[PDB]
């Protein structure tokens, strides 16, 4: 039904449409791996959209930020840092937050700091450190869509409707 170009623009619509303070959306895509020796399903960054809401740390941060702008000032917050750092992460299927979602076709809704730090998932604990309080992973056939917010958000039926209209499902 859907495809990679349509991938990003739908993540946009989901974050904008919802009446909740969602900070970003990410789509983790499937890949296959071998070694010299089996076939492993891999989750990786297919795309993402950020909406939003120490001078050692900050000068370091703006410096990569200016380094990616030349490739193709302001202050850069924790949520923004977490969003772009996430582009380098990958998840073996059934491992971590996005992997566990995909193996069992599961939607994991983590609401509250305690739910994040008690989830046993690395990515959930890392998101909490950068101020996230809600993190969601909804397993699609196309992949896994991840939502995250600095606010505490309960699972809305209106949101699960929008997610279902913007991604592939078996």
């Amino acid at each position: 039904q859907f495809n990679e170009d349509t991938l990003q623009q739908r993540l946009q619509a989901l974050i904008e449409s919802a009446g909740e303070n969602w900070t970003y959306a990410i789509f983790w895509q499937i890949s296959h791996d071998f070694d010299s020796g089996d076939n492993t399903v891999i989750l990786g960054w297919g795309d993402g959209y950020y909406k939003g809401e120490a001078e050692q740390e900050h000068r370091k941060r703006v410096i990569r930020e200016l380094n990616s702008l030349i490739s193709g000032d302001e202050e850069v917050t924790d949520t923004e840092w977490f969003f772009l750092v996430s582009m380098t992460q990958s998840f073996v299927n059934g491992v971590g937050l996005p992997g566990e979602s995909f193996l069992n076709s599961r939607v994991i809704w983590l609401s509250g700091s305690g739910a994040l730090t008690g989830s046993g998932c690395e990515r959930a604990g890392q998101g909490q450190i950068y101020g996230l309080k809600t993190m969601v992973c909804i397993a699609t056939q196309n992949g896994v869509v991840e939502l995250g917010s600095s606010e505490v958000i309960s699972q809305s039926s209106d949101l699960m409707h929008k997610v279902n209209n913007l991604f592939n499902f078996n």
Binding site: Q8, G72, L84
Partner: peptide, 20 residues
């Protein structure tokens, strides 16, 4: 604002971009 548009710039290409 400014940083947000750059994030979405890198995001839409980060699939092909291997070294971020």
């Amino acid at each position: 604002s400014s940083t947000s548009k750059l994030l979405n710039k890198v995001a839409a290409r980060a699939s092909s971009m291997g070294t971020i």
